[PDB]
Structure 1
């Protein structure tokens, strides 16, 4: 009510942690602030066969990739490349 909710989440890329501030916009898009740069992100998850795909647009650039979330690692598979991101484990 009368405020915008911002969520602080930490994602470990390689050996260095990264902190991301996510803002839940009213229209349904998200504004993520990483370091001093901000990105406008929107997308959805659609499943083809048994594979789940993520279609998203980042700052007006749209892309699709297969999304796999196994254990505390996030796998993003795409023609451009493959990305692995580790979710930190609570102590």
Structure 2
């Protein structure tokens, strides 16, 4: 009510912890700030066969990738490449 929710998320890329400030916009998009850069992110999940696909647009750039979240690792498969991101495990 009368304010915007900003979520502080932490993700690990290799040995580096990345702090992401995610703001939930009214229209359903997300404003993510990493360090000094801001990104406008919007997307949805759709299923092809048995594989879940993530359709997203970052700062107006649209792309599709296969999303798998197993244990504490996020697997993103795109024709550009594959990236693994680790979700920190609470002590």
TM-score tier by shorter-chain length is: over 0.9
Question: Any runs of at least 4 consecutive aligned residues in structure 1 with deviations exceeding 4 A, and if so which?
Answer: none
Alignment: residue pair count: 91
1:26 counterpart SS class: coil
Give 1:61 shift: 0.2
C-alpha offsets along residues 32-77 of structure 1, whole Å, 9 cap, x if unaligned? 0000000000000000110000000000000000000000000000
* TM-score using structure 2 length: 0.99
In structure 2, what is the Cα distance between the partners aligned to 1:82 and 1:48? 18
Q: Please tell me the root mean square deviation across aligned C-alpha atoms, in Å.
A: 0.3
How much has 1:78 moved relative to structure 2? 0.6
Corresponding residue for residue 74 of structure 2: 74
- 5+ residue gaps, structure 1: none
Q: Distance in 2 between matches of 1:16 and 1:43?
A: 26
SS class of match (1:90)? coil
- Structure 2 unpaired stretches of 5+: none
Q: State TM-score, norm by structure 1.
A: 0.99
